[PDB]
Structures are given as C-alpha cells and as structure tokens.
Amino acid sequence: NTQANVADAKSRIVDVDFAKETSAMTKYQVLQQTGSAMLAQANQLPQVALSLLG
Amino acid sequence: NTQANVADAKSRIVDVDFAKETSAMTKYQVLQQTGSAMLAQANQLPQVALSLLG
C-alpha cells in the first residue's frame, strides 16, 4: 500500500503533464514562424535609402 | 537588451540621415551650375573697354 502512495507523490513532482506540455509546444511553433517572417521583413528596411537617389 | 539601446544612442551621434544629406547634395549641385554661369559671364565684363575705340 505505502509503495503505491509514494509513487503518487513522486510523479507529481518530476513527471510532465502532456496536456500542459503539448499546448506549450504548439504555442511556440506559431511564435517561431511569426518571428522568422518579422525578422526577414525587418532586414530589408534599409533598402529605403536606395530610393532617395543612392 | 542593453546592447540594442546603446546602439540606438550611438547611431544618433555618428550616423547620417539620408533625407537630410540627399537634399543638401542636390542643394549644392544647383549652386555649382549657377556659380559657373555667373563666373563665365563675369569674366567678359572688361570687353566693354574695346567698344570705346580700343
């Protein structure tokens, strides 16, 4: 009996909850694609200087 | 974070603004052609002396 209850206590501390973890993993995937598009588009900001005659 | 803000401060001091610089560059180009025409025409002022019989 006591072995089962200690296993309960030990899992709440070191084990992951997939419901919590899966949401976070999908959460950051969107942020990565958002970050890549923003960075690529922000890199060509200085090309405005070429419009004003070199 | 602090690296980005120092880059802001450093660029305002040493970097040019092309909007400011391009206007000045075009500003002086006109003055050069104006100056050249005035100088060439002012050089032949003394030819009036030839009209009064040498």
Side-chain angles (χ1 to χ4, degrees):
Chain A
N1 302 3
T2 191
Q3 175 156 90
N5 315 121
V6 181
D8 262 358
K10 178 195 180 250
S11 91
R12 319 203 161 114
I13 316 184
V14 302
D15 201 332
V16 306
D17 212 41
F18 280 62
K20 270 296 326 312
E21 218 35 74
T22 296
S23 305
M25 157 162 192
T26 324
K27 186 63 171 163
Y28 281 116
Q29 273 172 30
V30 174
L31 288 161
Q32 221 193 42
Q33 303 163 76
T34 315
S36 323
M38 297 338 282
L39 182 49
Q41 187 161 8
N43 273 356
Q44 52 158 351
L45 290 187
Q47 270 166 229
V48 185
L50 271 148
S51 297
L52 316 96
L53 182 143
Chain B
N1 302 3
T2 191
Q3 175 156 90
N5 315 121
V6 181
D8 262 358
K10 178 195 180 250
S11 91
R12 320 203 161 114
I13 316 184
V14 302
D15 201 332
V16 306
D17 212 41
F18 280 62
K20 270 296 326 312
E21 218 35 74
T22 296
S23 305
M25 157 162 192
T26 323
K27 186 63 171 163
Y28 281 116
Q29 273 172 30
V30 174
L31 288 161
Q32 221 193 42
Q33 303 163 76
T34 315
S36 323
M38 297 338 282
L39 182 49
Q41 187 161 8
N43 273 356
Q44 52 158 351
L45 290 187
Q47 270 166 229
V48 185
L50 271 148
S51 297
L52 316 96
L53 182 143

